[PDB]
Design a protein around this ligand. Structure first.
Ligand SMILES: [Fe+3]
Ligand SMILES: [Fe+3]
Lengths: 363, 363
């Protein structure tokens, strides 16, 4: 009901010592009080891109397992992400998530992020080439709540039909594409303003054809999701994207797979074998196959790579996604909003997570 | 000896209406006077990278022809630029440049910019592979005034030897290289803070290895040459670099060759054949080979592409290069500086240029 003497961190109002008051899942009072801080309090993290973690996958619909673990990473809202697959699996995953949300009305599961199958085979990376295909009027009809996000390649055939999804409370995101700057722009002019795990799975930035990568950097209101594991991007790259995009244009993401948190074993992603050596999962041919990055580590990493403030980390770890997903009462520690919060020690180790005014994790 | 009622534009003191008094080749008084501007006065343009123009070529040491024409572009300081060549033709070019300067004391020719032969063969652009080769203790003794700039590849063998040229009033600049971010840093740490015609002739930006391209975007005090002909960089690319680096980080350059200003056809640059279509010179396989851009158009294009201010235009077209070259008395409209000026109309066309208090061009 009340968290006192903390370093309160709001993406908009800044960071300051004070106390926060929670009344039945709603923050009713934020009082700035000058004293010595107990720890850090931030908006509950949001992971819009995670396949599985600690044995649980989205392909087997282990929502309950995923949810429960994520609380230990301070994540209070997530999107179980799929990989390229059959219209059949898709309908089944959307169906079980829909039932899962109806059964657990206070869950951290916002819905499903459909990564693929409408992507480029040339930038398929880790996606099963057999399932990749162009969008069809027949499939478009099966995509709706609980789908919340969709990653597509703008140059693919019939990519335009996907625009009809936005009115269904689905956010479109460009990724796994070789589209040029103008092809991406056709979609940017229609409201598509997000890029999936930048810059992996895109044609590089060239001197005349800047492509999607160039659009991503050039356009100020296009947000870029970044996997901060030191492998998908080097610390220098992250530092560069941060320099160009600032906190306002970056969305932290995990892109974690079931293997995360497990010994260097040997599993699969969809219908493909993956080898995990030193935490880095890759296909046999060397292609990165997701990550084993815990959201919590993502935040620490980002913070270390850039030297940004805890106020900026709040934007990249929750506020930015909330804005994309239309979650107007989340990603904030301000009077009138939902009490999804995470308490951390000064080193940013999670020590407590709150989802709807209820403590769902204590270390 | 007075140009009055113009819109004066100083890189540092900003823009204001006024009068400028010139005496004995020196700006003696700058006075802010209210009233409607006659035209636009700017510090004389500086081009540190130009091979040839209107039939005049650095390789043939057509210094006189180059100087005369550049005045109509408002350029009051330039560096005749070579390409990879024999030690022999290099000494001759330096020898004649020296003679030319001793004979025309108030000439716009500051000296020579040695582009090559210490570059990498993977990124030789239009350079002849036959002359590219590593530097040596001996070859270096042959390099000194009028040499004022040297473009080299940091990864090439013995590249470290080039650091000794700095104390001889020579600016080092990185280009035509597949140098990694770290190989570049060794030189950055030693004072190299410039990149030649960014980003043509450099390895592309990659997710883990950001290379020189990354280094040039990320490091703030590293300046970048930009050829704004709309071909070496698309207008979108120029807008990107501008956004990231700001006016302070950009040095406008022409990279113009002999063919510039002449009708399409076929000529040479060094020992190679070149085809010019629609004003775009290219080698037999399409490799870009210099340009046909007039400095005057360069200034207008940068402004159109970026929408920058007249004061910023002054920084990219003059001041930044003066700073890098140590011309403490140039690139300013201030009491005590050299009277090298360009007066343009409001559409930014050159109407008059002055070198050392002398009018050297009228439209
Ligand atoms: Fe992916
Ligand atoms: Fe070149």
């Amino acid at each position: 009901m009340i968290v006192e003497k903390v370093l309160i961190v709001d993406p908009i109002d800044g960071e300051f010592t004070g106390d926060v008051e929670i009344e039945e899942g709603k923050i009713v009072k934020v009082e700035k009080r000058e004293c010595i801080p107990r720890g850090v309090l931030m908006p509950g993290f949001v992971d819009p891109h995670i396949h599985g973690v600690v044995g649980a996958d989205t392909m087997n619909c282990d929502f309950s397992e995923m949810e429960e673990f994520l609380y230990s990473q301070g994540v209070t809202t997530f999107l179980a992400t799929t990989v390229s697959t059959s219209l059949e699996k898709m309908k089944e995953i959307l169906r079980k998530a829909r039932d899962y949300i109806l059964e657990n009305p206070s869950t951290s599961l916002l819905g499903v992020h459909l990564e693929g199958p409408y992507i480029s085979k040339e930038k398929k990376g880790a996606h099963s080439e057999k399932h990749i295909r162009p969008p069809s009027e027949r499939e478009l009809s099966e995509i709706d709540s609980p789908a919340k996000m969709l990653t597509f390649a703008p140059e693919i055939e019939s990519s335009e039909l996907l625009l009809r999804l936005v009115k269904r409370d689905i956010v479109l995101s460009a990724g796994h594409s070789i589209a040029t700057f103008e092809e991406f722009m056709k979609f940017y002019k229609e409201g598509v303003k997000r890029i999936t795990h930048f810059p992996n799975g895109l044609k590089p930035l060239h001197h005349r054809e800047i492509g999607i990568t160039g659009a991503g950097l050039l356009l100020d209101d296009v947000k870029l999701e970044l996997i901060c594991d030191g492998v998908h991007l080097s610390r220098e790259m992250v530092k560069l994207v941060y320099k160009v995009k600032k906190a306002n244009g970056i969305v932290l993401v995990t892109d974690s797979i079931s293997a995360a948190g497990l010994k260097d074993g040997t599993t699969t992603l969809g219908d493909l074998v993956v080898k995990v050596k030193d935490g880095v999962p890759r296909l046999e041919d060397g292609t990165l196959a997701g990550s084993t990055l815990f959201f919590s580590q993502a935040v620490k990493n980002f913070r270390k790579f850039t030297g940004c403030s805890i106020t900026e980390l709040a934007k990249v770890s929750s506020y930015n996604s909330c804005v994309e997903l239309g979650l107007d009462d989340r990603g904030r520690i301000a009077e009138g909003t939902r009490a999804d919060l995470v308490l951390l020690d000064e080193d940013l180790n999670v020590v407590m997570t709150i989802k709807e005014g209820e403590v769902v994790f204590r270390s």
